[PDB]
Amino acid sequence: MKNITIYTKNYCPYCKKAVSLLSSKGVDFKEVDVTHDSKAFEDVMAKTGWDTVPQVFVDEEFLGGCDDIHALDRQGILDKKLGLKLEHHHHH
């Protein structure tokens, strides 16, 4: 399955909204709370160049934060990035 991870901190309505969104999709994912783990969050920042939370990843891709995944969802793209169901229209 895809490796889906959302990095969060406490006191962050954007993080929890984003977590609830990912929970509503039924996907398997990890919420990683780095409120007090500055080294873990430094590794995350080195990759993305953002110092805010949440930061959401699917495999190697940084999808972005709360605004970005909500926008992707409104566009119908979020489901695709989370590796949800693939459809095929078979034509005779």
Ligand X SMILES: N[C@@H](CCC(=O)N[C@@H](CSSC[C@H](NC(=O)CC[C@H](N)C(=O)O)C(=O)NCC(=O)O)C(=O)NCC(=O)O)C(=O)O
> CB under 6 A: which stretch of 20-28, 34-42, 64-72, 83-91 binds ligand X?
64-72
**Does position 49 bind ligand X by CB under 6 A?**
no
* Residue tagged 């080195």 (tokens): 46
CB neighbour list of residue 3: distance below 8 Å, 6 or more residues apart: 57, 58, 59
**Contact status: 35 vs ligand X (CB under 6 A):** no
Per rule CB under 6 A, is residue 62 in the interface with ligand X?
Answer: no
| Cβ–Cβ under 8 Å, residues 10 and 35 | yes
Task: List interacting residues with ligand X (CB under 6 A).
Answer: 11-14, 51-54, 65-67
